[PDB]
């Protein structure tokens, strides 16, 4: 198991994708999966260990190209929307 990295996972057939981190929320003993107001699969428990894994979707966001007129110059400046660029280079 790898954590704090955007890796695909298939928990006994879940075949989801996201980032698995430590989860501060406390799953009840019988509960296995987790959801939210949008029933998104927010948390999953390990199939071999009694560990709760918070799941966040991999960073996505439309890019924008701030460009002056091409008749003026060909230089541009790219805006990666709604992402911190400590993780932009990928």
């Amino acid at each position: 198991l790898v954590k704090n990295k955007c890796v695909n996972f298939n928990f006994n057939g879940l075949t989801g994708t996201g980032v698995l981190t430590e989860s501060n929320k406390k799953f009840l003993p019988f509960q296995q999966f987790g959801r939210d107001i949008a029933d998104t699969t927010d948390a999953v428990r390990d199939p071999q260990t009694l560990e709760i894994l918070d799941i966040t979707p991999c960073s996505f966001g439309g890019v924008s190209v701030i460009t002056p007129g091409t008749n003026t110059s060909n230089q541009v400046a790219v805006l990666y929307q709604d992402v911190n660029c400590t993780e932009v280079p990928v």
Binding site: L28, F30, Q31, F33, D36
Partner: peptide
């Protein structure tokens, strides 16, 4: 009773 095995918070 809990209908299934899903954890929900303020839902």
């Amino acid at each position: 009773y809990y209908p299934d095995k899903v954890f929900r918070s303020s839902v």
